[PDB]
Amino acid sequence: ETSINVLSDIEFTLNGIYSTMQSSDAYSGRLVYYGDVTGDDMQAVSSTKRTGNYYRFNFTKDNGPSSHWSYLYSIIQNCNLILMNVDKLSIDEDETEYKNDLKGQALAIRGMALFDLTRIFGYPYLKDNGASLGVPIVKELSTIDSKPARNTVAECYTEIISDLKNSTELLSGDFNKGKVNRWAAMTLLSRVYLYKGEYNEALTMAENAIKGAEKEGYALWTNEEYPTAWGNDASASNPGEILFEIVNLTTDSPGKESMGYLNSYNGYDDMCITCSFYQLLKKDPKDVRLKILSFDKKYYAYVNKYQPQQGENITDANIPLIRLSEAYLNAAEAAVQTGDNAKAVKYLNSIVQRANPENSVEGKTLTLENVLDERRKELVAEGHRMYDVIRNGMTVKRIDVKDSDINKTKHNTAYMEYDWNFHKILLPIPKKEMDANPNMKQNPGYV
Ligand SMILES: [Ca+2]
């Protein structure tokens, strides 16, 4: 009289999880754009745009969004459902790998979801070695009586790393369209290690993610492919470089609040690049990433990474959530941070030279800032920038510079410079949670 009796129930539960992740309130929108419009390289096009209140840090405890919280905990609950049951199922010898991968998917997803909750609602690990409040670690199934208190950021990372590490030992390395695989999980785990300052472990995981994905036939998009590769429909025979893709379909659409519709002047004209980022990017006019900018006349430049597949509306563009390019940048960062310049130059040069083969960082003693300056060009509109500055104890500095190629783009915010002491880099705990859970403590500066 329960929901998991046979393996296919696990597959059904995973399908539900991926369908939840596809929402524009989850990984087809809000969970992606958060780290861009709270940074320095993208902004809301106006205060009344969907991204406006995030860009302006305009939320209060009384009006803050609840979707990040609800969607991620929904996902975690179904992962728990799988994880509490999957090992009890008796299966055939020849279903073992398949079952191991299903369990690995659930573990990777739980780690991802708890990582997102922790970075959204808790101060960065390296501020105080995870001493601040993260969120509740929920590993079983909720009932009406469940009223957990927030664990620490450190405790959360313990769980995040444990789930992801274990997933890397269970997940298949095969191409798996719209699903998490070994190389995607290793790449995320490398990111999680960087945020924690575990650079040796970050480096090992990024390097192995690359070696494994490339043996499997994934490859960085060439300079020639880059401008249009985003609209390809990858397959096992042509994987491209996306290691985990959110698949959106004409017949299964996330709607007009998706990245595809927000990042387009044919959509909601919602979020664009800042002038300072345009000026940084165009310092090298042969940088191939200039070719994924879509200009609304001479007013705004949108990041045209959410390219619909053939026949589709921009609404149903897939989300390139984890890319091989990030494993390269993670390895570069971890190399710098462990004092291996040779290795940093090796990995960084692959990104640099794909953007423009006439450039090289050979002969440079690479700095963290050098690596992050490449990373911001590569990962613009994919949800990284604010976190990457803030996690490193750096100050986000919005620059009010003008450019005549994008002459309507200008900052419009009270908040131009901020670091990990700014209380609004964290969303407040949603009111519905505060109202329903008396063991829930609000983030500082809000109450
Ligand atoms: Ca699509």
What CATH number did the domain enclosing 230 receive? Answer: 2.20.20.130
Instruction: Tell whether 244 and 142 lie within a shared domain.
Output: no
Answer whether 322's CB lies under 8 Å from 187's CB.
yes
Give me the CATH number covering residue 171: 1.25.40.390
Rounded CA-CA distance 118/110 in Å is 12
> Which residues are placed with Cβ below 5 angstroms of ligand 1, an ion?
248, 309, 316, 318
Contact 437, 431 (CB under 8 A): no
CB neighbours of 88 closer than 8 A, spacing ≥ 6? Answer: none
Same domain for 178 and 248, yes or no, is no
**Contact call for residues 134 and 156 (beta carbons, < 8 A):** yes
Q: 370 CA to middle of ligand 1, Å?
A: 34
140 C-beta neighbours (distance < 10 Å), count: 11
Ligand 1 centroid to residue 135 C-alpha, Å: 33
In a shared domain, residues 204 and 278: no
Looking up residue 351, the CATH number of its domain turns out to be 1.25.40.900
**Is 57 exposed, middle or buried, given 0-12, 13-18 or 19+ CB atoms closer than 10 A?**
middle
294 Cα to the center of ligand 1, angstroms: 19
Rounded Cα–Cα distance for residues 416 and 393 (Å): 16
Resolution of the PDB structure in angstroms: 1.9
Nearest Cα neighbor of 180 from 288, 122, 103, 248 is 103
Q: Are residues 69 and 181 in the same domain?
A: yes
Q: Do 284 and 170 share a domain, yes or no?
A: no
In this structure, the answer to whether residues 36 and 89 fall within a common structural domain is: yes
CA 258, 264, 270, 276 dihedral sign is positive
Q: How far is the CA of 21 from the centre of ligand 1 (A)?
A: 14
Single out the residue of 101, 81, 116, 214 nearest to residue 167, CA to CA: 101
Structure tokens at 134: 């993260």
Q: Which two tokens stand for residue 185?
A: 């999980």
- Ligand 1 centroid to 230 CA: how many Å? 10
Q: What is the whole-number distance in angstroms between the Cα of residue 145 and the centre of ligand 1?
A: 40
From the CA of 311, how far away is ligand 1's center (Å)? 9
267 domain-assigned:
no
Whose structure tokens read 């890319």? Answer: 323
Judgement on whether residues 237 and 369 belong to the same structural domain of the protein = no
- List, as residue ranges, the binding site for Ca(2+): 248, 312, 316, 318
Nearest to 55, CA basis, from 442, 398, 431, 443: 398
Q: Which domain holds residue 425?
A: 6-217+417-439
> Could you tell me if residue 1 is inside a domain?
no
Distance (angstroms) between ligand 1 centre and the Cα of 296 equals: 23
Task: Let me know: does 62 contact 431? Beta carbons within 8 Å.
Answer: yes
Distance 251 CA to ligand 1 centre (A): 10
CA of 319 to the centre of ligand 1 (A): 8
Q: What length does the chain have?
A: 447
Cα–Cα distance measured from residue 167 to residue 13, given in angstroms and rounded to the nearest whole number: 17
CB 267 within 8 A of CB 315: yes
List Cα–Cα distances, 296 to 99, 274, 288, 439, in angstroms. Answer: 49, 14, 19, 49
Known binding-site residues equal 248, 312, 316, 318
Q: Which amino acid appears at position 447 of this protein? A: V
Please give the distance, rounded to the nearest whole angstrom, from the Cα atom of residue 314 to the centre of ligand 1.
8
Q: Are residues 236 and 296 in the same domain?
A: no
Taking a C-beta distance cutoff of 8 angstroms, is the pair 278, 403 a contact?
yes
* 3 CA from centroid of ligand 1 (Å): 31
One domain for residues 127 and 231:
no
Residues 376 and 280 in one domain: yes
Residue 212 within a domain: yes
Q: How many whole angstroms from 221 Cα to the centroid of ligand 1?
A: 19
105 falls within a domain: yes
Q: Which tokens sit at 47?
A: 């205060």
Tell me, in angstroms, the distance from the centre of ligand 1 to residue 233's CA.
Answer: 8
In whole angstroms, what is the distance from residue 357 CA to residue 336 CA?
22
Distance 172 CA to ligand 1 centre (A): 24
- CA 302, CA 269: separation in Å to the nearest integer? 8
Max Cα-Cα span within the chain: 66
Q: How many separate domains does the chain show?
A: 3
Ligand 1 centre and the CA of 306: distance in Å?
A: 9
Let me know whether 297 and 316 are in one domain: no
d(CA 228, CA 221): 10
CA of 163 to the centre of ligand 1 (A): 29
Same domain, 197 and 338: no
Distance 82 CA to ligand 1 centre (A): 27
Q: Give Cα separations from 39 to 112, 208, 278, 305 (angstroms).
A: 21, 30, 14, 18
Report the separation in Å between the CA atom of 312 and the middle of ligand 1, taken as the mean of its atom positions: 7
- Solved with: X-ray
Domain-embedded: residue 231: yes
Q: Which two tokens stand for residue 25?
A: 């309130």
Q: How far apart are CA 381 and CA 371, in angstroms?
A: 18
Is 359 part of a structural domain of the chain? yes
Residue 323 alpha carbon to ligand 1 centre in Å: 17
Its sign, for the CA torsion 190, 192, 193, 194, is: positive
Domain end call among 264, 293, 323: 323
